[PDB]
Amino acid sequence: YEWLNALPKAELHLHLEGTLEPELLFALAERNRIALPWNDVETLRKAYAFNNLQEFLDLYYAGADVLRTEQDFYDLTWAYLQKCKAQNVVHVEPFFDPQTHTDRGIPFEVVLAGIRAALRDGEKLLGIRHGLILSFLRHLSEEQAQKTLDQALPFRDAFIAVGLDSSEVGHPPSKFQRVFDRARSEGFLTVAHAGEEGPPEYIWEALDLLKVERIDHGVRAFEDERLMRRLIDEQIPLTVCPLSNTKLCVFDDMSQHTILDMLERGVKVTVNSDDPAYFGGYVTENFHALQQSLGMTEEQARRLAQNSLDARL
Ligand SMILES: [Zn+2]
């Protein structure tokens, strides 16, 4: 573990809302005078058991309620940044889901103020470079996403890219092609969740329609040889999340994971924690699961960690 923990890493697939530890959630509910549906921290944690992406999302979104003030968003992001410091993550390019908060009445400026403030601290105090990524909720309409992009324009320089998460299946990348086209037109790079629960077809759409710089997850590309060859050949990064895939049942076991297989084939795969508060581990716990269950070597360790550095935007 320690050896894995000491590797220089970049995290490129990480939802700030997904770093919301049960402990923090309760203390934020206390500071905001919110009565939680959960009786204690331990009952919330016990509820972190999922049969699929949606069961997790439902609870993930429920957790966002306690996020209401700028100081809430600062606390959230600063707590995660300290995790990065402990685990020697020297560079972060994290998602947030503005709609989850703006739709609850929290002003866009307030969400950003807290995150941005923390990121400044992370860089000047912790030495951690950052590239904030604004993610659209794919289960909502392109229209709502357009409205979100309008809110972000005055702020555009705070974001290096736009992303695309939430319920994948039945909401293909094509659904958001116009808004992505506009974000690019307005100077945004692009990334997207694809081939987590979704078909390889969604990965192609992400590549050619949304014109992404990297694929988030992308594990189901292993079903598509001609896409495999494309990945391998173009060296497009994949932000693979081991514990996430296991906990959401993408793989029945960590020993079933194809990330090393992909690495050995030349796919520029990386390791990320995704929603570490929900999946029982941050980036280092992800590297470790790989070693324990797939006998990953220090060799592939250094290699994966180096890819995350290479894949920075
Ligand atoms: Zn994700």
PDB file of C-alpha atoms and ligand atoms in Angstrom:
ATOM      1  CA  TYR A   1       0.000   0.000   0.000  1.00  0.00           C
ATOM      2  CA  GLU A   2       2.549   2.601   1.153  1.00  0.00           C
ATOM      3  CA  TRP A   3       4.575   2.073  -2.008  1.00  0.00           C
ATOM      4  CA  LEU A   4       1.454   2.537  -4.112  1.00  0.00           C
ATOM      5  CA  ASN A   5       0.554   5.545  -2.016  1.00  0.00           C
ATOM      6  CA  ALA A   6       3.895   7.202  -2.672  1.00  0.00           C
ATOM      7  CA  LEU A   7       3.545   7.099  -6.456  1.00  0.00           C
ATOM      8  CA  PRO A   8       2.967  10.496  -8.077  1.00  0.00           C
ATOM      9  CA  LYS A   9      -0.563  10.383  -9.513  1.00  0.00           C
ATOM     10  CA  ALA A  10      -3.102  12.424 -11.409  1.00  0.00           C
ATOM     11  CA  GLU A  11      -6.804  11.882 -10.840  1.00  0.00           C
ATOM     12  CA  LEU A  12      -8.899  12.587 -13.935  1.00  0.00           C
ATOM     13  CA  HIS A  13     -12.137  10.787 -13.115  1.00  0.00           C
ATOM     14  CA  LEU A  14     -13.507  12.063  -9.813  1.00  0.00           C
ATOM     15  CA  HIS A  15     -16.846  13.603  -8.815  1.00  0.00           C
ATOM     16  CA  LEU A  16     -16.500  16.152  -6.019  1.00  0.00           C
ATOM     17  CA  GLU A  17     -20.028  15.291  -4.834  1.00  0.00           C
ATOM     18  CA  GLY A  18     -18.841  11.669  -4.713  1.00  0.00           C
ATOM     19  CA  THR A  19     -16.196  12.565  -2.131  1.00  0.00           C
ATOM     20  CA  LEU A  20     -18.961  13.384   0.356  1.00  0.00           C
ATOM     21  CA  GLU A  21     -17.985  11.237   3.332  1.00  0.00           C
ATOM     22  CA  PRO A  22     -20.798  10.069   5.604  1.00  0.00           C
ATOM     23  CA  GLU A  23     -19.080  11.964   8.426  1.00  0.00           C
ATOM     24  CA  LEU A  24     -19.017  15.229   6.488  1.00  0.00           C
ATOM     25  CA  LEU A  25     -22.573  14.812   5.248  1.00  0.00           C
ATOM     26  CA  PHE A  26     -23.835  14.621   8.846  1.00  0.00           C
ATOM     27  CA  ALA A  27     -21.811  17.627  10.020  1.00  0.00           C
ATOM     28  CA  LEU A  28     -23.005  19.704   7.057  1.00  0.00           C
ATOM     29  CA  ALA A  29     -26.585  18.659   7.795  1.00  0.00           C
ATOM     30  CA  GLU A  30     -25.961  19.811  11.374  1.00  0.00           C
ATOM     31  CA  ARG A  31     -24.511  23.176  10.320  1.00  0.00           C
ATOM     32  CA  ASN A  32     -27.433  23.646   7.911  1.00  0.00           C
ATOM     33  CA  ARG A  33     -30.021  22.477  10.488  1.00  0.00           C
ATOM     34  CA  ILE A  34     -31.220  19.663   8.215  1.00  0.00           C
ATOM     35  CA  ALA A  35     -32.961  16.594   9.616  1.00  0.00           C
ATOM     36  CA  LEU A  36     -31.587  13.594   7.738  1.00  0.00           C
ATOM     37  CA  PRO A  37     -33.628  10.530   6.665  1.00  0.00           C
ATOM     38  CA  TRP A  38     -30.693   8.569   8.065  1.00  0.00           C
ATOM     39  CA  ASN A  39     -30.529   7.885  11.768  1.00  0.00           C
ATOM     40  CA  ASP A  40     -26.720   7.877  12.085  1.00  0.00           C
ATOM     41  CA  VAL A  41     -23.510   7.903  10.054  1.00  0.00           C
ATOM     42  CA  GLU A  42     -23.316   4.148  10.192  1.00  0.00           C
ATOM     43  CA  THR A  43     -26.810   3.693   8.751  1.00  0.00           C
ATOM     44  CA  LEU A  44     -25.866   5.944   5.818  1.00  0.00           C
ATOM     45  CA  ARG A  45     -22.663   3.980   5.221  1.00  0.00           C
ATOM     46  CA  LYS A  46     -24.488   0.643   5.391  1.00  0.00           C
ATOM     47  CA  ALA A  47     -26.737   1.988   2.611  1.00  0.00           C
ATOM     48  CA  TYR A  48     -23.709   2.212   0.311  1.00  0.00           C
ATOM     49  CA  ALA A  49     -24.598  -1.088  -1.355  1.00  0.00           C
ATOM     50  CA  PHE A  50     -25.571  -0.979  -5.002  1.00  0.00           C
ATOM     51  CA  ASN A  51     -26.886  -3.401  -7.627  1.00  0.00           C
ATOM     52  CA  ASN A  52     -26.272  -0.997 -10.506  1.00  0.00           C
ATOM     53  CA  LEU A  53     -25.519   2.583 -11.570  1.00  0.00           C
ATOM     54  CA  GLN A  54     -29.024   3.875 -10.806  1.00  0.00           C
ATOM     55  CA  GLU A  55     -29.278   2.624  -7.231  1.00  0.00           C
ATOM     56  CA  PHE A  56     -26.063   4.537  -6.580  1.00  0.00           C
ATOM     57  CA  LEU A  57     -27.114   7.685  -8.417  1.00  0.00           C
ATOM     58  CA  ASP A  58     -30.417   7.846  -6.537  1.00  0.00           C
ATOM     59  CA  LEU A  59     -28.500   7.990  -3.258  1.00  0.00           C
ATOM     60  CA  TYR A  60     -25.678  10.107  -4.659  1.00  0.00           C
ATOM     61  CA  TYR A  61     -28.231  12.808  -5.568  1.00  0.00           C
ATOM     62  CA  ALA A  62     -30.013  12.498  -2.221  1.00  0.00           C
ATOM     63  CA  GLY A  63     -26.700  13.248  -0.532  1.00  0.00           C
ATOM     64  CA  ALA A  64     -26.340  16.580  -2.327  1.00  0.00           C
ATOM     65  CA  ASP A  65     -29.066  18.161  -0.142  1.00  0.00           C
ATOM     66  CA  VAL A  66     -26.598  19.125   2.584  1.00  0.00           C
ATOM     67  CA  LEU A  67     -24.573  21.159   0.090  1.00  0.00           C
ATOM     68  CA  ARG A  68     -26.067  24.612   0.389  1.00  0.00           C
ATOM     69  CA  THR A  69     -23.492  27.266   1.151  1.00  0.00           C
ATOM     70  CA  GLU A  70     -20.229  28.365  -0.399  1.00  0.00           C
ATOM     71  CA  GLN A  71     -18.525  27.103   2.767  1.00  0.00           C
ATOM     72  CA  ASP A  72     -20.178  23.698   2.208  1.00  0.00           C
ATOM     73  CA  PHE A  73     -18.648  23.441  -1.263  1.00  0.00           C
ATOM     74  CA  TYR A  74     -15.289  24.625   0.082  1.00  0.00           C
ATOM     75  CA  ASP A  75     -15.323  22.070   2.870  1.00  0.00           C
ATOM     76  CA  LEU A  76     -16.233  19.338   0.387  1.00  0.00           C
ATOM     77  CA  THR A  77     -13.475  20.198  -2.096  1.00  0.00           C
ATOM     78  CA  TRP A  78     -10.879  20.982   0.580  1.00  0.00           C
ATOM     79  CA  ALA A  79     -11.471  17.625   2.307  1.00  0.00           C
ATOM     80  CA  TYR A  80     -10.874  15.838  -1.008  1.00  0.00           C
ATOM     81  CA  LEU A  81      -7.785  17.931  -1.757  1.00  0.00           C
ATOM     82  CA  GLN A  82      -6.325  16.835   1.597  1.00  0.00           C
ATOM     83  CA  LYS A  83      -6.970  13.229   0.597  1.00  0.00           C
ATOM     84  CA  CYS A  84      -4.956  13.955  -2.540  1.00  0.00           C
ATOM     85  CA  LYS A  85      -2.120  15.381  -0.466  1.00  0.00           C
ATOM     86  CA  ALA A  86      -2.034  12.260   1.675  1.00  0.00           C
ATOM     87  CA  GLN A  87      -2.040   9.984  -1.369  1.00  0.00           C
ATOM     88  CA  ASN A  88       0.391  12.026  -3.442  1.00  0.00           C
ATOM     89  CA  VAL A  89      -2.109  12.971  -6.125  1.00  0.00           C
ATOM     90  CA  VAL A  90      -0.257  15.974  -7.527  1.00  0.00           C
ATOM     91  CA  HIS A  91      -2.786  16.907 -10.186  1.00  0.00           C
ATOM     92  CA  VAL A  92      -6.582  16.738 -10.224  1.00  0.00           C
ATOM     93  CA  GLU A  93      -9.150  17.292 -12.983  1.00  0.00           C
ATOM     94  CA  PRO A  94     -12.404  16.753 -11.091  1.00  0.00           C
ATOM     95  CA  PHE A  95     -16.052  16.821 -12.169  1.00  0.00           C
ATOM     96  CA  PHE A  96     -18.882  18.652 -10.517  1.00  0.00           C
ATOM     97  CA  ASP A  97     -22.598  18.536 -11.411  1.00  0.00           C
ATOM     98  CA  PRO A  98     -23.827  22.163 -11.316  1.00  0.00           C
ATOM     99  CA  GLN A  99     -27.399  21.104 -12.166  1.00  0.00           C
ATOM    100  CA  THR A 100     -27.703  18.933  -9.073  1.00  0.00           C
ATOM    101  CA  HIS A 101     -27.267  22.113  -7.058  1.00  0.00           C
ATOM    102  CA  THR A 102     -28.725  24.870  -9.212  1.00  0.00           C
ATOM    103  CA  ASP A 103     -31.919  22.830  -9.545  1.00  0.00           C
ATOM    104  CA  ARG A 104     -32.180  22.879  -5.732  1.00  0.00           C
ATOM    105  CA  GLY A 105     -31.983  26.672  -5.708  1.00  0.00           C
ATOM    106  CA  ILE A 106     -28.285  27.033  -4.875  1.00  0.00           C
ATOM    107  CA  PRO A 107     -26.833  29.795  -7.074  1.00  0.00           C
ATOM    108  CA  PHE A 108     -24.263  28.838  -9.703  1.00  0.00           C
ATOM    109  CA  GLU A 109     -21.861  31.487  -8.402  1.00  0.00           C
ATOM    110  CA  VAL A 110     -21.972  29.930  -4.908  1.00  0.00           C
ATOM    111  CA  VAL A 111     -21.125  26.390  -6.022  1.00  0.00           C
ATOM    112  CA  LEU A 112     -18.168  27.680  -8.044  1.00  0.00           C
ATOM    113  CA  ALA A 113     -17.001  30.107  -5.346  1.00  0.00           C
ATOM    114  CA  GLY A 114     -16.516  27.276  -2.837  1.00  0.00           C
ATOM    115  CA  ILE A 115     -14.875  24.837  -5.237  1.00  0.00           C
ATOM    116  CA  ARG A 116     -12.688  27.483  -6.834  1.00  0.00           C
ATOM    117  CA  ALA A 117     -11.546  28.773  -3.433  1.00  0.00           C
ATOM    118  CA  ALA A 118     -10.572  25.261  -2.311  1.00  0.00           C
ATOM    119  CA  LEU A 119      -8.741  24.605  -5.603  1.00  0.00           C
ATOM    120  CA  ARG A 120      -6.706  27.769  -5.085  1.00  0.00           C
ATOM    121  CA  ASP A 121      -5.748  26.531  -1.627  1.00  0.00           C
ATOM    122  CA  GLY A 122      -4.918  23.088  -3.009  1.00  0.00           C
ATOM    123  CA  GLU A 123      -2.534  24.642  -5.493  1.00  0.00           C
ATOM    124  CA  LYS A 124      -0.824  27.362  -3.470  1.00  0.00           C
ATOM    125  CA  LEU A 125      -0.619  25.349  -0.226  1.00  0.00           C
ATOM    126  CA  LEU A 126      -0.637  21.708  -1.364  1.00  0.00           C
ATOM    127  CA  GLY A 127       1.160  22.016  -4.733  1.00  0.00           C
ATOM    128  CA  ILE A 128      -1.817  20.455  -6.534  1.00  0.00           C
ATOM    129  CA  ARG A 129      -2.610  21.593 -10.089  1.00  0.00           C
ATOM    130  CA  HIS A 130      -6.243  21.417 -11.119  1.00  0.00           C
ATOM    131  CA  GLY A 131      -8.453  21.401 -14.172  1.00  0.00           C
ATOM    132  CA  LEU A 132     -12.095  21.809 -13.203  1.00  0.00           C
ATOM    133  CA  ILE A 133     -14.559  19.946 -15.409  1.00  0.00           C
ATOM    134  CA  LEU A 134     -18.233  20.948 -15.586  1.00  0.00           C
ATOM    135  CA  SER A 135     -20.402  17.882 -16.138  1.00  0.00           C
ATOM    136  CA  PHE A 136     -23.936  17.812 -17.529  1.00  0.00           C
ATOM    137  CA  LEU A 137     -26.563  15.437 -16.148  1.00  0.00           C
ATOM    138  CA  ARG A 138     -27.360  13.135 -19.062  1.00  0.00           C
ATOM    139  CA  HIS A 139     -30.769  12.020 -17.735  1.00  0.00           C
ATOM    140  CA  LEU A 140     -31.994  15.596 -18.089  1.00  0.00           C
ATOM    141  CA  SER A 141     -32.680  17.325 -21.389  1.00  0.00           C
ATOM    142  CA  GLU A 142     -30.153  18.962 -23.686  1.00  0.00           C
ATOM    143  CA  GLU A 143     -32.265  22.087 -23.133  1.00  0.00           C
ATOM    144  CA  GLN A 144     -31.482  22.117 -19.402  1.00  0.00           C
ATOM    145  CA  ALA A 145     -27.831  21.475 -20.275  1.00  0.00           C
ATOM    146  CA  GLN A 146     -27.882  24.449 -22.646  1.00  0.00           C
ATOM    147  CA  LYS A 147     -29.210  26.635 -19.843  1.00  0.00           C
ATOM    148  CA  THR A 148     -26.387  25.358 -17.644  1.00  0.00           C
ATOM    149  CA  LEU A 149     -23.821  26.196 -20.314  1.00  0.00           C
ATOM    150  CA  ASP A 150     -25.271  29.734 -20.520  1.00  0.00           C
ATOM    151  CA  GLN A 151     -24.656  30.088 -16.768  1.00  0.00           C
ATOM    152  CA  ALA A 152     -21.085  28.894 -17.230  1.00  0.00           C
ATOM    153  CA  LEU A 153     -20.086  31.228 -20.095  1.00  0.00           C
ATOM    154  CA  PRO A 154     -19.117  34.222 -17.929  1.00  0.00           C
ATOM    155  CA  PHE A 155     -17.233  31.650 -15.847  1.00  0.00           C
ATOM    156  CA  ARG A 156     -15.828  29.712 -18.783  1.00  0.00           C
ATOM    157  CA  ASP A 157     -12.207  30.195 -17.733  1.00  0.00           C
ATOM    158  CA  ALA A 158     -12.801  28.173 -14.546  1.00  0.00           C
ATOM    159  CA  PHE A 159     -13.376  25.019 -16.545  1.00  0.00           C
ATOM    160  CA  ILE A 160     -10.976  23.167 -18.799  1.00  0.00           C
ATOM    161  CA  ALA A 161     -13.709  20.957 -20.259  1.00  0.00           C
ATOM    162  CA  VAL A 162     -17.340  19.883 -20.127  1.00  0.00           C
ATOM    163  CA  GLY A 163     -18.278  16.362 -19.137  1.00  0.00           C
ATOM    164  CA  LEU A 164     -21.238  14.052 -19.271  1.00  0.00           C
ATOM    165  CA  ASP A 165     -22.356  11.740 -16.454  1.00  0.00           C
ATOM    166  CA  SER A 166     -25.427  10.217 -14.779  1.00  0.00           C
ATOM    167  CA  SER A 167     -27.691   7.402 -16.057  1.00  0.00           C
ATOM    168  CA  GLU A 168     -25.901   6.270 -19.224  1.00  0.00           C
ATOM    169  CA  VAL A 169     -28.168   3.665 -20.823  1.00  0.00           C
ATOM    170  CA  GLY A 170     -30.944   5.236 -22.881  1.00  0.00           C
ATOM    171  CA  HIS A 171     -29.259   8.646 -22.877  1.00  0.00           C
ATOM    172  CA  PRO A 172     -26.572   8.351 -25.560  1.00  0.00           C
ATOM    173  CA  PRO A 173     -23.943  11.075 -26.218  1.00  0.00           C
ATOM    174  CA  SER A 174     -25.813  12.058 -29.417  1.00  0.00           C
ATOM    175  CA  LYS A 175     -28.522  13.490 -27.165  1.00  0.00           C
ATOM    176  CA  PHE A 176     -26.089  16.248 -26.144  1.00  0.00           C
ATOM    177  CA  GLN A 177     -24.272  16.898 -29.391  1.00  0.00           C
ATOM    178  CA  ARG A 178     -25.552  20.443 -29.850  1.00  0.00           C
ATOM    179  CA  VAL A 179     -24.537  21.688 -26.399  1.00  0.00           C
ATOM    180  CA  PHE A 180     -21.153  19.962 -26.637  1.00  0.00           C
ATOM    181  CA  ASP A 181     -20.652  21.530 -30.077  1.00  0.00           C
ATOM    182  CA  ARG A 182     -21.354  24.896 -28.479  1.00  0.00           C
ATOM    183  CA  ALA A 183     -19.078  24.330 -25.503  1.00  0.00           C
ATOM    184  CA  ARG A 184     -16.290  23.479 -27.946  1.00  0.00           C
ATOM    185  CA  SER A 185     -17.184  26.546 -29.982  1.00  0.00           C
ATOM    186  CA  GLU A 186     -16.909  28.571 -26.763  1.00  0.00           C
ATOM    187  CA  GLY A 187     -13.467  27.172 -25.990  1.00  0.00           C
ATOM    188  CA  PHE A 188     -14.247  24.120 -23.866  1.00  0.00           C
ATOM    189  CA  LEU A 189     -12.439  20.815 -24.273  1.00  0.00           C
ATOM    190  CA  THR A 190     -14.683  17.766 -23.912  1.00  0.00           C
ATOM    191  CA  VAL A 191     -14.802  14.465 -22.039  1.00  0.00           C
ATOM    192  CA  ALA A 192     -17.558  11.924 -21.406  1.00  0.00           C
ATOM    193  CA  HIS A 193     -18.724   8.820 -19.553  1.00  0.00           C
ATOM    194  CA  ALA A 194     -19.068   6.005 -22.053  1.00  0.00           C
ATOM    195  CA  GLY A 195     -19.166   2.211 -21.985  1.00  0.00           C
ATOM    196  CA  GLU A 196     -19.602   1.856 -18.240  1.00  0.00           C
ATOM    197  CA  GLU A 197     -23.027   0.254 -18.439  1.00  0.00           C
ATOM    198  CA  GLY A 198     -23.497   1.576 -21.966  1.00  0.00           C
ATOM    199  CA  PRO A 199     -22.727  -0.235 -25.246  1.00  0.00           C
ATOM    200  CA  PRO A 200     -19.454   0.299 -27.189  1.00  0.00           C
ATOM    201  CA  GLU A 201     -21.630   2.242 -29.645  1.00  0.00           C
ATOM    202  CA  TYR A 202     -21.839   5.000 -27.022  1.00  0.00           C
ATOM    203  CA  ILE A 203     -18.046   5.177 -26.969  1.00  0.00           C
ATOM    204  CA  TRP A 204     -17.988   5.752 -30.745  1.00  0.00           C
ATOM    205  CA  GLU A 205     -20.599   8.501 -30.337  1.00  0.00           C
ATOM    206  CA  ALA A 206     -18.499  10.109 -27.598  1.00  0.00           C
ATOM    207  CA  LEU A 207     -15.442   9.946 -29.841  1.00  0.00           C
ATOM    208  CA  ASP A 208     -16.951  11.290 -33.052  1.00  0.00           C
ATOM    209  CA  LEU A 209     -20.067  13.249 -32.013  1.00  0.00           C
ATOM    210  CA  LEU A 210     -18.929  14.825 -28.726  1.00  0.00           C
ATOM    211  CA  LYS A 211     -15.313  14.836 -29.946  1.00  0.00           C
ATOM    212  CA  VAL A 212     -13.911  14.091 -26.503  1.00  0.00           C
ATOM    213  CA  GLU A 213     -10.241  14.221 -25.449  1.00  0.00           C
ATOM    214  CA  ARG A 214     -10.672  11.151 -23.276  1.00  0.00           C
ATOM    215  CA  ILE A 215     -13.186   8.439 -22.423  1.00  0.00           C
ATOM    216  CA  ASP A 216     -14.477   8.084 -18.877  1.00  0.00           C
ATOM    217  CA  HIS A 217     -14.730   4.385 -17.930  1.00  0.00           C
ATOM    218  CA  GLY A 218     -14.721   2.911 -21.439  1.00  0.00           C
ATOM    219  CA  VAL A 219     -14.430  -0.643 -20.110  1.00  0.00           C
ATOM    220  CA  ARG A 220     -17.069  -2.006 -22.499  1.00  0.00           C
ATOM    221  CA  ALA A 221     -14.805  -1.170 -25.438  1.00  0.00           C
ATOM    222  CA  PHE A 222     -13.328  -4.570 -24.655  1.00  0.00           C
ATOM    223  CA  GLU A 223     -16.331  -5.994 -26.476  1.00  0.00           C
ATOM    224  CA  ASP A 224     -15.421  -4.163 -29.660  1.00  0.00           C
ATOM    225  CA  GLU A 225     -12.177  -5.202 -31.356  1.00  0.00           C
ATOM    226  CA  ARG A 226     -12.195  -2.525 -34.029  1.00  0.00           C
ATOM    227  CA  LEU A 227     -12.666   0.048 -31.258  1.00  0.00           C
ATOM    228  CA  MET A 228      -9.936  -1.571 -29.189  1.00  0.00           C
ATOM    229  CA  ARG A 229      -7.620  -1.098 -32.134  1.00  0.00           C
ATOM    230  CA  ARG A 230      -8.763   2.521 -32.409  1.00  0.00           C
ATOM    231  CA  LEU A 231      -8.092   3.174 -28.722  1.00  0.00           C
ATOM    232  CA  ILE A 232      -4.712   1.474 -28.885  1.00  0.00           C
ATOM    233  CA  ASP A 233      -3.814   3.280 -32.105  1.00  0.00           C
ATOM    234  CA  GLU A 234      -4.924   6.811 -31.199  1.00  0.00           C
ATOM    235  CA  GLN A 235      -3.775   6.505 -27.564  1.00  0.00           C
ATOM    236  CA  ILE A 236      -6.990   8.118 -26.335  1.00  0.00           C
ATOM    237  CA  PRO A 237      -6.962   7.958 -22.504  1.00  0.00           C
ATOM    238  CA  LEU A 238      -9.467   5.877 -20.521  1.00  0.00           C
ATOM    239  CA  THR A 239     -10.349   6.965 -16.998  1.00  0.00           C
ATOM    240  CA  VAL A 240     -10.955   3.519 -15.509  1.00  0.00           C
ATOM    241  CA  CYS A 241     -12.452   3.227 -12.021  1.00  0.00           C
ATOM    242  CA  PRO A 242     -11.820  -0.188 -10.453  1.00  0.00           C
ATOM    243  CA  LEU A 243     -13.783  -0.037  -7.168  1.00  0.00           C
ATOM    244  CA  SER A 244     -16.571   1.852  -8.912  1.00  0.00           C
ATOM    245  CA  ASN A 245     -16.999  -0.938 -11.464  1.00  0.00           C
ATOM    246  CA  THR A 246     -17.028  -3.618  -8.768  1.00  0.00           C
ATOM    247  CA  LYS A 247     -19.440  -1.763  -6.474  1.00  0.00           C
ATOM    248  CA  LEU A 248     -21.794  -0.963  -9.372  1.00  0.00           C
ATOM    249  CA  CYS A 249     -21.552  -4.586 -10.569  1.00  0.00           C
ATOM    250  CA  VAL A 250     -19.972  -3.785 -13.919  1.00  0.00           C
ATOM    251  CA  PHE A 251     -17.685  -6.655 -12.958  1.00  0.00           C
ATOM    252  CA  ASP A 252     -18.798  -9.454 -10.643  1.00  0.00           C
ATOM    253  CA  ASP A 253     -15.369  -9.423  -9.032  1.00  0.00           C
ATOM    254  CA  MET A 254     -12.165  -7.395  -9.134  1.00  0.00           C
ATOM    255  CA  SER A 255     -10.483 -10.524 -10.492  1.00  0.00           C
ATOM    256  CA  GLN A 256     -12.775 -10.126 -13.520  1.00  0.00           C
ATOM    257  CA  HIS A 257     -11.498  -6.620 -14.314  1.00  0.00           C
ATOM    258  CA  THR A 258      -9.980  -6.027 -17.727  1.00  0.00           C
ATOM    259  CA  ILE A 259      -7.907  -2.950 -16.916  1.00  0.00           C
ATOM    260  CA  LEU A 260      -4.550  -4.724 -16.847  1.00  0.00           C
ATOM    261  CA  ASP A 261      -5.516  -6.671 -19.949  1.00  0.00           C
ATOM    262  CA  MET A 262      -6.154  -3.347 -21.665  1.00  0.00           C
ATOM    263  CA  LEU A 263      -2.909  -1.880 -20.350  1.00  0.00           C
ATOM    264  CA  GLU A 264      -0.921  -4.832 -21.691  1.00  0.00           C
ATOM    265  CA  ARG A 265      -2.561  -4.340 -25.089  1.00  0.00           C
ATOM    266  CA  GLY A 266      -1.497  -0.699 -25.223  1.00  0.00           C
ATOM    267  CA  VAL A 267      -4.710   1.035 -24.195  1.00  0.00           C
ATOM    268  CA  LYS A 268      -3.834   4.243 -22.339  1.00  0.00           C
ATOM    269  CA  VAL A 269      -5.846   3.262 -19.284  1.00  0.00           C
ATOM    270  CA  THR A 270      -5.616   5.145 -15.971  1.00  0.00           C
ATOM    271  CA  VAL A 271      -6.750   4.550 -12.381  1.00  0.00           C
ATOM    272  CA  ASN A 272      -9.268   6.779 -10.597  1.00  0.00           C
ATOM    273  CA  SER A 273     -11.623   6.528  -7.594  1.00  0.00           C
ATOM    274  CA  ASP A 274     -14.747   8.103  -9.190  1.00  0.00           C
ATOM    275  CA  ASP A 275     -16.969   8.381  -6.108  1.00  0.00           C
ATOM    276  CA  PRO A 276     -14.557   7.380  -3.303  1.00  0.00           C
ATOM    277  CA  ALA A 277     -16.914   8.187  -0.423  1.00  0.00           C
ATOM    278  CA  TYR A 278     -19.401   5.715  -1.937  1.00  0.00           C
ATOM    279  CA  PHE A 279     -17.024   3.002  -3.136  1.00  0.00           C
ATOM    280  CA  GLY A 280     -14.842   2.669  -0.032  1.00  0.00           C
ATOM    281  CA  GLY A 281     -11.606   4.029  -1.405  1.00  0.00           C
ATOM    282  CA  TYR A 282      -9.690   6.843  -3.016  1.00  0.00           C
ATOM    283  CA  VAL A 283      -7.204   6.548  -5.861  1.00  0.00           C
ATOM    284  CA  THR A 284      -4.571   4.631  -3.840  1.00  0.00           C
ATOM    285  CA  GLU A 285      -7.154   2.114  -2.657  1.00  0.00           C
ATOM    286  CA  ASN A 286      -7.909   1.587  -6.337  1.00  0.00           C
ATOM    287  CA  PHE A 287      -4.296   0.829  -7.305  1.00  0.00           C
ATOM    288  CA  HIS A 288      -4.173  -1.556  -4.381  1.00  0.00           C
ATOM    289  CA  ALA A 289      -7.286  -3.533  -5.258  1.00  0.00           C
ATOM    290  CA  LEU A 290      -5.618  -4.070  -8.632  1.00  0.00           C
ATOM    291  CA  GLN A 291      -2.511  -5.523  -7.008  1.00  0.00           C
ATOM    292  CA  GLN A 292      -4.407  -7.712  -4.566  1.00  0.00           C
ATOM    293  CA  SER A 293      -6.977  -9.118  -6.999  1.00  0.00           C
ATOM    294  CA  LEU A 294      -5.176  -8.982 -10.368  1.00  0.00           C
ATOM    295  CA  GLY A 295      -1.602  -9.323  -9.126  1.00  0.00           C
ATOM    296  CA  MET A 296      -0.695  -5.997 -10.672  1.00  0.00           C
ATOM    297  CA  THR A 297       3.070  -5.484 -10.463  1.00  0.00           C
ATOM    298  CA  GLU A 298       5.050  -2.379  -9.528  1.00  0.00           C
ATOM    299  CA  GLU A 299       5.798  -2.340 -13.235  1.00  0.00           C
ATOM    300  CA  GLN A 300       2.213  -1.786 -14.263  1.00  0.00           C
ATOM    301  CA  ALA A 301       1.810   0.457 -11.235  1.00  0.00           C
ATOM    302  CA  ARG A 302       4.418   2.926 -12.442  1.00  0.00           C
ATOM    303  CA  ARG A 303       2.919   2.621 -15.907  1.00  0.00           C
ATOM    304  CA  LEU A 304      -0.691   3.379 -14.924  1.00  0.00           C
ATOM    305  CA  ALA A 305       0.408   6.296 -12.732  1.00  0.00           C
ATOM    306  CA  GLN A 306       2.506   7.675 -15.573  1.00  0.00           C
ATOM    307  CA  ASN A 307      -0.432   7.439 -17.984  1.00  0.00           C
ATOM    308  CA  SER A 308      -2.543   9.614 -15.702  1.00  0.00           C
ATOM    309  CA  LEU A 309       0.237  12.217 -15.858  1.00  0.00           C
ATOM    310  CA  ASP A 310       0.404  11.892 -19.646  1.00  0.00           C
ATOM    311  CA  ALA A 311      -3.373  12.146 -19.995  1.00  0.00           C
ATOM    312  CA  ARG A 312      -3.628  15.540 -18.278  1.00  0.00           C
ATOM    313  CA  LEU A 313      -5.415  18.219 -20.339  1.00  0.00           C
TER     314      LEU A 313
HETATM  315 ZN    ZN B   1     -18.105   8.738 -12.931  1.00  0.00          ZN
END
